[model samples]
Target: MSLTSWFLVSSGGTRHRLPREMIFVGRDDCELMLQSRSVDKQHAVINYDASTDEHLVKDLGSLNGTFVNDVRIPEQTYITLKLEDKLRFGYDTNLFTVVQGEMRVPEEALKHEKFTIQLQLS
Candidate 1:
């Protein structure tokens, strides 16, 4: 079975596969780039701890703060990621999601996925 470790979901329900053990989301200097003023240079990190065998979402002391399920996550601490958990960075500028399931997309579906990008990049 073709499987990826994690998926970082988007506001539009798009799922970006997290291929690495640790994934970062931020305005820049992140494996997953989130371009938002409210999002810091390193807003949050999704880490895979070998001991725990789970993905941990942590806030990296951002001004706005990180939230899950509409509740703020206190700084410098991490939470075990649950499936379909609602995530937010700050300022309500962008929404976040964690893909909490077996992510197996057919080749035909994956083929059309890229062409399905709705945004017009400048």
Candidate 2:
């Protein structure tokens, strides 16, 4: 079964979109290396690893911090992602939304059942 996940970030009234890519890193893949900054280079990277069934986020150890709702998340922490979850990142105060569901691909990927989540942010 395959899943299609989307993650968005908004802060300081600015919104940033996260790429939905699946990384099949070996067990030895460094948690830090998969961070948003490390992966994307230009913008902050929000690394999504399906194999782990978790979204590994890094603030690049920035001075500010990442937040879900109003709660702050420590650097290098892997936050469990859910559908329609809101995410905030860095000193920029950007915000994002996380959306995940079953995905289908021809030849390479298989289809899986679908699910939905309704989320509200304050």
Candidate 3:
């Protein structure tokens, strides 16, 4: 299994995807625009799936907070996502999508970043 692609969004509505591993780490409000700004606050990290139709959000417990569809989630909680699930982390709202297949990551991110990898079998 390998990482087939990666997606990144920055402030100002800029979206980019890479076929290899990419590094994305920042403070609570660092990459606000890249995420779903519809949510209230931004957590440190969040993993969204447009295929399996889920949004697995992790709250590194920022000074502000993280919200799912306007509901504030506690820290260290792995919230199961649904289709069009709104994720609010640090004043941004992003919709989650449930797709098919496996979402793989590079060993580097698995070693460094705080994230979760989910495998959905159709």
Candidate 4:
């Protein structure tokens, strides 16, 4: 499926569907804005690379970090985002579920599920 039709759904029933070459993530000016201090003003991005036919995620020097499946990605590097992948910006407890399909209520309910990760502090 082409990113011209994409869905980034959060467990809170927040859904982002934008038809663009790339979608930005931030609190200030982002397609998928996460309203949390942990998330940067201009955090990260999801871009569709026509040449590779793949959807990629890249960090934008965010203060906390960008994570895929709970693992932080390197800055300025593109990483593949697969269906049902977990995406979290910074240290926010909220998680975004990556998906592709039409924006429908039934599908939203099905895909809006998330995973919880626990950290043990030293």
By summed lDDT, which 10 consecutive residues of candidate 1 come out lowest? 113-122
Arranged by TM-score, best first: 4, 1, 2, 3
lDDT of candidate 1 over 32-104, digit per residue (tens): 7777788899888888866755678899999999899889999989888777887887665557677745655
44, model 4: CA deviation in Å?
0.7
For every candidate in turn, the CA RMSD to the true structure comes to 8.2, 10.5, 9.0, 12.6
lDDT per residue for candidate 3 within 1-122, as digits (tens), equals: 34433343333354443222212223334443333433334445546555654436567666556666678788877676453455445564333232223355565665543342432222
Among the numbered candidates, top lDDT falls to: 4
Displacement of residue 103 (Cα, Å) in model 4 is: 4.0
Query: Candidate 2, 118: how far from true, in Å?
Result: 30
Write one digit per residue (lDDT tens) for candidate 2, span 14-108: 33333434332111253212234323222223566756655655444544566666577776566666666766554332356665444433533
What overall lDDT, based on C-alpha atoms, would model 3 receive against the true structure?
0.46
Error of 2 at 83 (Å): 1.6
lDDT of 4 by residue, 1-122 (tens): 11234567787778776444788888897877788999999899889876655678899999998999989999989998888998899987678897777543343343443411111110
What lDDT is obtained when candidate 2 is compared to the true structure? 0.45
How many clashing residue pairs are found in candidate 2?
A: 13
lDDT of 2 at 28: 28
Alpha carbon deviation, residue 70, candidate 2 (Å): 1.4
Ranking by lDDT: 4, 1, 3, 2
- Write down the lDDT of every candidate, Cα atoms only: 0.73, 0.45, 0.46, 0.75
